[PDB]
Design a protein around this ligand. Structure first.
Ligand SMILES: CNC(=O)c1cc(C2(C#N)CCC2)cc(NS(=O)(=O)c2cc(Br)cc(Cl)c2O)c1O
Length: 304
C-alpha cells in the first residue's frame, strides 16, 4: 500500500533560499521562511500568496506556529527570535539573548514557552507573554540544528552538528539523555513522534533514524535519499497512511513506509535540493521547498 501524491500548485515569491515550511495547526495556512529575511504566508489548500511578514535584519532559518495558529515564532541570523501575531502581522516581541545566529525554534504545546537553538551552542527557553529568557542550557559543542517539545511540554529534544541528540527536562534543565549510534555524524534535525514515544533524527550521512529515547534504542532507519550537507527536516505523515517524508539533495521528496522502511514514493519536479517539507494536519497534502536554483514551493495531494 502506497500513496499517490500528485502536484497541485507551485508557489513562488521568495528571492533567496527557503529554509523552512510549516502548516498551521488549523490547516488554513502554510508559512515559509527564507534567507531573504522574510516570512511568507500562503493559503494551504490553493497556494494563494497571502502576505509577507518583515522585520528581521538578516536571513531566517526557521519558523513555527503556536498551537492555536494565532502566533508564529521565527529564528534569524540577526541573533533574535521574533513572535508575530499572524492576523495583524505585528511583531509582538523580539527575543534577544543568543550570542550567535538562531537556527531553530518551536512553541511548547501550551504555547506559553518557546525553545530555541543557536550557532552559540545553546538551547534557550523563553516566556511568550513577556519575551524574556527563562533558562539557558549549555546544550552542545557545535551549532544546535533543531529543538522540539514533547507531548506535554515536560521534555525538550535538541540535535546538534556535534552528532548528539539530547533530551532535557524543561523545568530543571537537566540533560536526561544523550542518543548516539556507535558513530557521530552531524545531526541536522530531530523531533518527537506524534505519540510522543519516539524521536525522529536526521544525520548528514544520508540517514533518518527513529529512536525510543527512554530505552536508548534505534527502532527504525530510513535510507535511500541524499543528505550530506543541508538542514533537511523530516516529517511524520499522520492523515492517511503512516509515512515518513523528507526532502533530499537529489531534488526529490522521499516518502517511506513507517513500519517497513521501504520507499513508497518519490516526488519529482524540483530543480534543486529539496530543503524542507511539511505535512498538512488533516488532508493528505505535502508542501515541499527547494533551494535557490529552483526557488519554488510545491503542494502535492494524495488520495491516501
Ligand atoms: C500500526 N502502526 C502504528 O500504529 C505505529 C507504529 C510505530 C512504529 C512501527 N513500526 C514503532 C516504531 C515506529 C509508531 C507509531 N507511533 S508514531 O511513530 O508516533 C506515528 C507515526 C506516524 Br508516520 C503516524 C502516526 Cl499517527 C504515529 O502515531 C505508530 O502509531
Amino acid at each position: 500500500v502506497k500513496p499517490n501524491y500528485a502536484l497541485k500548485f507551485t508557489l513562488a515569491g521568495h528571492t533567496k533560499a527557503v529554509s523552512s515550511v510549516k502548516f498551521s495547526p488549523n490547516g488554513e495556512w502554510l508559512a515559509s521562511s527564507s534567507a531573504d529575511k522574510l516570512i511568507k504566508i500562503w493559503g494551504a489548500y490553493d497556494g494563494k500568496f497571502e502576505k509577507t511578514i518583515s522585520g528581521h535584519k538578516l536571513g531566517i532559518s526557521d519558523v513555527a506556529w503556536s498551537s492555536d495558529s494565532n502566533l508564529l515564532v521565527s529564528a534569524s541570523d540577526d541573533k533574535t527570535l521574533k513572535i508575530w501575531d499572524v492576523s495583524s502581522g505585528k511583531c509582538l516581541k523580539t527575543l534577544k539573548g543568543h550570542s550567535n545566529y538562531v537556527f531553530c525554534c518551536n512553541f511548547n504545546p501550551q504555547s506559553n514557552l518557546i525553545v530555541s537553538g543557536s550557532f552559540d551552542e545553546s538551547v534557550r527557553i523563553w516566556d511568550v507573554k513577556t519575551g524574556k529568557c527563562l533558562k539557558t542550557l549549555p546544550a552542545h559543542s557545535d551549532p544546535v540544528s533543531a529543538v522540539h517539545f514533547n507531548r506535554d511540554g515536560s521534555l525538550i529534544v535538541s540535535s546538534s552538528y556535534d552528532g548528539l541528540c539530547r533530551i532535557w527536562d524543561t523545568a530543571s534543565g537537566q540533560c536526561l539523555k544523550t542518543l548516539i549510534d556507535d558513530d557521530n555524524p552531524p545531526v541536522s534535525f530531530v523531533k518527537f513522534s506524534p505519540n510522543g514515544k519516539y524521536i525522529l533524527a536526521a544525520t548528514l550521512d544520508n540517514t533518518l533514524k527513529l529512536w525510543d529515547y527512554s530505552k536508548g534504542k534505534c527502532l527504525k532507519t530510513y535510507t535511500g535519499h541524499k543528505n550530506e550537507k543541508y538542514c533537511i527536516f523530516a516529517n511524520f505523515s499522520v492523515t492517511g497512511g503512516k509515512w515518513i517524508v523528507s526532502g533530499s539533495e537529489d531534488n526529490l521528496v522521499y516518502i517511506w513506509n513507517l513500519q517497513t522502511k521501504e520507499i513508497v514514493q518519490k516526488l519529482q519536479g524540483h530543480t534543486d535540493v529539496v530543503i524542507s517539507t511539511a505535512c498538512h494536519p488533516t488532508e493528505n497534502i505535502i508542501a515541499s521547498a527547494a533551494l535557490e536554483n529552483d526557488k519554488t514551493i510545491k503542494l502535492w495531494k494524495s488520495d491516501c
